[PDB]
């Protein structure tokens, strides 16, 4: 760990600065270092970890999609080689995040809020691996589904339907169903049920909670509009 010599608090502070500078690779390295200190992460710290790696892998996914499309049309070795290079780097980032979750964020997350957060992340990074997998692929897909479903089960027992982690989990699991599992009806049913159950609970929310929940509800609606 190249971050092993830096104080945990300094790593968190620098992750926040990297975010403001849109330096997401740095942000992810700082947050990896913070995780490797071995202590549990607070809610803010989990959000910092998630934002950093989401942005890094999101850039890799966007690039992979551009290159894959070019490769498909072309069907020399260069396009394949370069797509493979990006793919391998993306898989490396996913393996790194899954490694952090397995060593040892998930096992040490006692609270439902933390366990759901990390199981959602596990589903997300298996989903990103599944996007680029080509057969191996089945095991990755089933692994994503199992992580998402365990998170769903916990979230339903322990969180209200407006909780933003529960909502984002359902949003992402719905996308998994649509784009990975080739189960669009499951995707649509989950987004709709999630939206309707949250709508019925908005009356319980303060102004701040209402803003969080309705933001994600709009994303659910956006996806349903795309899919129907």
């Amino acid at each position: 760990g190249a971050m092993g010599s830096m104080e945990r608090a300094s790593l968190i502070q620098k992750a926040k600065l990297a975010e403001q500078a849109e330096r997401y690779e740095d942000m992810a390295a700082f947050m990896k270092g913070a995780v490797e200190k071995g202590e549990e992460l607070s809610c803010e710290e989990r959000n910092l970890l998630s934002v950093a790696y989401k942005n890094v892998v999101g850039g890799q996914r966007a690039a992979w999609r551009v290159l894959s499309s070019i490769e498909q049309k072309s069907n020399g070795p260069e396009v394949r080689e370069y797509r493979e290079k990006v793919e391998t780097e993306l898989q490396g980032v996913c393996d790194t995040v899954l490694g952090l979750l397995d060593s040892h964020l998930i096992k040490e997350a006692g609270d439902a809020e933390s366990r759901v957060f990390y199981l959602k992340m596990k589903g997300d990074y298996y989903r990103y691996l599944a996007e680029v997998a080509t057969g191996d692929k089945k095991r990755i897909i089933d692994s994503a589904r199992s992580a998402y479903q365990e998170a769903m089960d916990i979230s339903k027992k322990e969180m209200p339907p407006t909780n933003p982690i529960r909502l984002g989990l359902a949003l992402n699991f719905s996308v998994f169903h649509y784009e990975i599992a080739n189960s669009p009806e499951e995707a649509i049913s989950l987004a709709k049920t999630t939206f309707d159950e949250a709508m019925a609970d908005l009356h319980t929310l303060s102004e701040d909670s209402y803003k969080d929940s309705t933001l994600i509800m709009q994303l659910l609606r956006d996806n349903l509009t795309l899919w129907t």
Partner: peptide, 5 residues
Amino acid sequence: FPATV
């Protein structure tokens, strides 16, 4: 592509 968070 669809929204995820």
